[PDB]
Scaffold this motif. Structure first.
Motif, short mmCIF file in Angstrom:
data_model
loop_
_atom_site.label_atom_id
_atom_site.label_comp_id
_atom_site.label_asym_id
_atom_site.label_seq_id
_atom_site.Cartn_x
_atom_site.Cartn_y
_atom_site.Cartn_z
N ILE A 1 -16.63 -26.99 -84.63
CA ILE A 1 -17.43 -27.48 -83.53
C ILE A 1 -18.21 -28.73 -83.97
O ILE A 1 -18.23 -29.76 -83.28
CB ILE A 1 -18.35 -26.34 -83.02
CG1 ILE A 1 -17.53 -25.31 -82.22
CG2 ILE A 1 -19.50 -26.88 -82.16
CD1 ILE A 1 -18.27 -24.00 -81.95
N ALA A 2 -18.83 -28.64 -85.14
CA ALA A 2 -19.59 -29.77 -85.67
C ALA A 2 -18.72 -31.08 -85.80
O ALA A 2 -19.19 -32.21 -85.49
CB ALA A 2 -20.25 -29.38 -87.00
N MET A 3 -17.46 -30.90 -86.22
CA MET A 3 -16.55 -32.03 -86.42
C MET A 3 -15.66 -32.33 -85.20
O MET A 3 -14.73 -33.13 -85.29
CB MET A 3 -15.70 -31.84 -87.68
CG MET A 3 -16.53 -31.57 -88.93
SD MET A 3 -17.59 -32.93 -89.44
CE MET A 3 -16.39 -34.00 -90.22
N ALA A 4 -15.99 -31.72 -84.06
CA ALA A 4 -15.26 -31.98 -82.82
C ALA A 4 -15.13 -33.45 -82.47
O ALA A 4 -15.94 -34.30 -82.87
CB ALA A 4 -15.90 -31.27 -81.68
N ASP A 5 -14.10 -33.75 -81.71
CA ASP A 5 -13.89 -35.08 -81.21
C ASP A 5 -14.56 -35.15 -79.84
O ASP A 5 -15.00 -36.22 -79.40
CB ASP A 5 -12.38 -35.39 -81.13
CG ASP A 5 -11.72 -35.48 -82.52
OD1 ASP A 5 -12.24 -34.91 -83.50
OD2 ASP A 5 -10.66 -36.13 -82.63
N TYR A 6 -14.62 -34.00 -79.17
CA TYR A 6 -15.20 -33.87 -77.83
C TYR A 6 -15.82 -32.49 -77.73
O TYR A 6 -15.29 -31.54 -78.33
CB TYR A 6 -14.12 -34.00 -76.76
CG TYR A 6 -13.52 -35.37 -76.71
CD1 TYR A 6 -14.10 -36.36 -75.93
CD2 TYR A 6 -12.40 -35.68 -77.46
CE1 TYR A 6 -13.56 -37.66 -75.89
CE2 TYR A 6 -11.86 -36.95 -77.44
CZ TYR A 6 -12.44 -37.94 -76.65
OH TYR A 6 -11.89 -39.22 -76.63
#
Lengths: 171, 169
Positions: A143-148
């Motif tokens: 979640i932290a490294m999500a793109d969106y």
């Protein structure tokens, strides 16, 4: 182009996926891959089964099993539902390339709980535990490294649009 | 009421914290709080984070919050903004010290966004995430009440900030 769906227990991320396959797209549901492998070998519950898989086969393992799930087929959108760690992501990336995006579907606890509680394991203690179990898998980092990140408290009609948009802004 | 701002290193947390600062709300900057403690507890080198770890090793990873509440004059009945939390351990602490009405808001920026920003090498910035996540910021974001995302436009970024703040208040 690949989209990985990630989301905490009661997130509704499934509706986002229902949306994608409806607009023609290869949707592969990670828990059913493990599910289908369960059909094949017996830890005891689906949980502890995938606990051994990662413990024996890899960080890591389930992404491979999905990529193997996928054919060498040839699809425009491939969608992997329910990543849980950066391990799975690295795998997907390595295997599939560079058009791989993380979309986290967000919903704050109190909602996810009431959402789940109302599903025709209803004790708040157990839900809170189930979140922790999930956080221990590393979903938090995904979640932290999500793109969106799509959120949804409120309105399906809300959620729907935030999807239509996050999808095209990828597509 | 308490607002917790969380976010990844390039996220643009500051801008939200600023926006509130500008409103009137008292903002405590957690990393500044730690610095102040440096002056007493740290010694010779201690490349910040090095001493930030030793603190949690010594008083348990709740500490930073305990020191932020130590700052916030234990009488202060008005709303306070803490920016920015790294671990659920600290959310727990704030709650256990300031009660129910506690809100985690989080600012999102895609890693590629986040970096282009911070630059304006790459390896180092990815290590600084690896570290941050190792502090469990991921779960904080995971368990966030609100997640404001930060793509282009301070204008759109600002508008989403108000949406939440008002919602929160």
């Amino acid at each position: 182009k690949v989209i990985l769906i990630t989301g905490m227990p009661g997130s509704g991320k499934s509706e986002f996926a229902k949306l994608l396959k409806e607009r023609g797209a290869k949707v592969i549901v990670m828990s059913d891959v493990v599910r289908k492998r369960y059909s094949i070998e017996a830890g005891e519950r689906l949980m502890d089964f995938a606990k051994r898989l990662r413990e024996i086969y890899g960080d890591g393992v389930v992404a491979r099993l999905c990529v193997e799930e996928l054919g060498t087929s040839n699809h425009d959108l491939v969608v992997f539902d329910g990543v849980r760690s950066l391990a799975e992501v690295e795998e997907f990336k390595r295997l599939l390339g560079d058009s791989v995006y993380i979309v986290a579907v967000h919903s704050p606890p109190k909602i996810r709980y009431k959402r789940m509680i109302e599903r025709l394991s209803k004790e708040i203690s157990e839900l809170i535990r189930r979140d922790r179990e999930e956080l221990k898998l590393g979903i938090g980092e995904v979640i932290a490294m999500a793109d969106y990140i799509i959120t949804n408290d409120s309105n399906y009609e809300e959620f729907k649009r935030r999807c239509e948009e996050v999808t095209d802004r990828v597509l």
